[PDB]
């Protein structure tokens, strides 16, 4: 008399990946396994009463592989195990892009250099964590929106690096916000907008 887990969903942002499910356990515990094929199963969260399991350490080993997960239900320590398969998950194609942050927007002469902070992830290589830019390379684009604080109409520009060098009218203050987008995706394509930064 156990309840099969249901509504198994992947919650992932910048590769930080957690599998979630229902229900809150009642006299039972769960074990979650992960694999990349059929017979590659590895248990990661053993007999927990939690309804989530962080699987980051596993998926970051290779963010472009497709992972399968299964959640087993077992009777608790008081008085055939049921299990359910999760949806497939491919990190590189599905992790959500986190909110960007503008690092600086220095105006030198008639130009403003807008630099986006590179974001470190849990994905590591050569004994070092990788930045979002490191992982995606040119697959990642930043859209900039800018406007004169003293006017209505916005302007825009894009870059496949982390900086924008834009012309501005002298003696004018502009506001800026950036957004990340992965053109090759069909869903979860964009991040939310960065906080707005304004000159002066």
């Amino acid at each position, epitope marked *: 008399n156990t309840v099969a887990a249901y509504n198994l969903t992947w919650k992932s942002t910048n590769f930080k990946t957690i599998l979630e499910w229902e229900p809150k356990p009642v006299n039972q515990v769960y074990t979650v396994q992960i694999s990349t094929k059929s017979g590659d199963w590895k248990s990661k969260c053993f007999y927990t009463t939690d309804t989530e399991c962080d699987l980051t350490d596993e998926i970051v080993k290779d963010v472009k592989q497709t992972y399968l997960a299964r959640v087993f239900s077992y009777p608790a320590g008081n008085v055939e195990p049921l299990y359910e398969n999760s949806p497939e998950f491919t990190p590189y194609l599905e992790t959500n892009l986190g909110q960007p942050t503008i690092q600086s927007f220095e105006q030198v002469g008639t130009k403003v250099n807008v630099t986006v902070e590179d974001e470190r992830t849990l994905v590591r290589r050569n004994n070092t964590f990788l930045s979002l830019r490191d992982v995606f390379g040119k697959d990642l684009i930043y*859209t900039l929106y800018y406007w004169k604080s003293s006017s209505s*109409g916005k302007k*825009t520009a*894009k870059t496949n690096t982390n900086e924008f060098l834009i012309d501005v009218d002298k003696g004018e203050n502009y506001c800026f916000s950036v957004q990340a*987008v992965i053109p090759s995706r*069909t869903v*979860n*394509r964009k991040s939310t907008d960065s906080p707005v930064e304004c000159m002066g």
Partner: antibody, heavy 117, light 108 residues
Framework: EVQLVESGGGLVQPGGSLRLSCAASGFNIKEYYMHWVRQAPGKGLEWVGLIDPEQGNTIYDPKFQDRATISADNSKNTAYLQMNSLRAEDTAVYYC??????????WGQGTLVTVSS | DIQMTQSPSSLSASVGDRVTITCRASRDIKSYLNWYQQKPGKAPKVLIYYATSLAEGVPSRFSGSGSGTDYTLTISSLQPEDFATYYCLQHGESPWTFGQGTKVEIKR
């Protein structure tokens, strides 16, 4: 299956306003940037503007900034274009296009606006 | 804005001929230059994006090259179905700007 269907075309009196809609299906417009592009009879493509349904940001070509309004309704998954004080040169086929940030990958069928009395 | 000058305005070529169309920007556009093909009574269709990338499903006879201010669309061996008007588009910054187009006529 992605589809963009425009409507609102037809006659507009000189000095009047065209008011068009672009109904999208098969995807959520908030995932992309939606643009309007027009083409006068026998002439070239002309960019009008874009709207980012993520937050409603709109960018207009300077030629249309003071006479047009682009908007979007995520709940109706529809984008719109209104342009005012129309003259003969505004008679054209108006297209709605989906922008992936790399290119336009889907287009509406286009709708003709004829400025006439 | 950034003016895009497309050359020639029209050309006539036989099936099997190599065809070259060029687009020059008034200033560096950093390869955010696409090529679109438009047939009679239809919406434009992407051929090349980011200056040199062939869009999915587009025949290999179409290719793009260039960087900075100068770009070229090449059709290595013209086919009858390539009759169309071709347009370049600068989209790295607003306002986005289209070239004036090149009408390709087929000699037969």
């Amino acid at each position: 299956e992605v589809q963009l269907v425009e409507s609102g075309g037809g006659l507009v009196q000189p000095g009047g306003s065209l008011r068009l809609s672009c109904a999208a299906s098969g995807f959520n417009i908030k995932e992309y940037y939606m643009h309007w592009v027009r083409q006068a009879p026998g002439k070239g493509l002309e960019w009008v503007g874009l709207i980012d349904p993520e937050q409603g940001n709109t960018i207009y070509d300077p030629k249309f900034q003071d006479r047009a309004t682009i908007s979007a309704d995520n709940s109706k998954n529809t984008a719109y274009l209104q342009m005012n004080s129309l003259r003969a040169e505004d008679t054209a086929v108006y297209y709605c296009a989906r922008d992936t940030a790399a290119y336009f990958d889907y287009w509406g069928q286009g709708t003709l606006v004829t400025v006439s009395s | 804005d950034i003016q895009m000058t497309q050359s020639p305005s029209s050309l006539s070529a036989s099936v099997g001929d190599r065809v070259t169309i060029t687009c020059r920007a008034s200033r560096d556009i950093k390869s955010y230059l696409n090529w679109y093909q438009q047939k009679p009574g239809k919406a434009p269709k992407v051929l090349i994006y980011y200056a040199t990338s062939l869009a999915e499903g587009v025949p290999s006879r179409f290719s793009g090259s260039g960087s900075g201010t100068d770009y070229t669309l090449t059709i290595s061996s013209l086919q009858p179905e390539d009759f169309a008007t071709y347009y370049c588009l600068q989209h790295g910054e607003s306002p986005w700007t289209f070239g004036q187009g090149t009408k390709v006529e087929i000699k037969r």
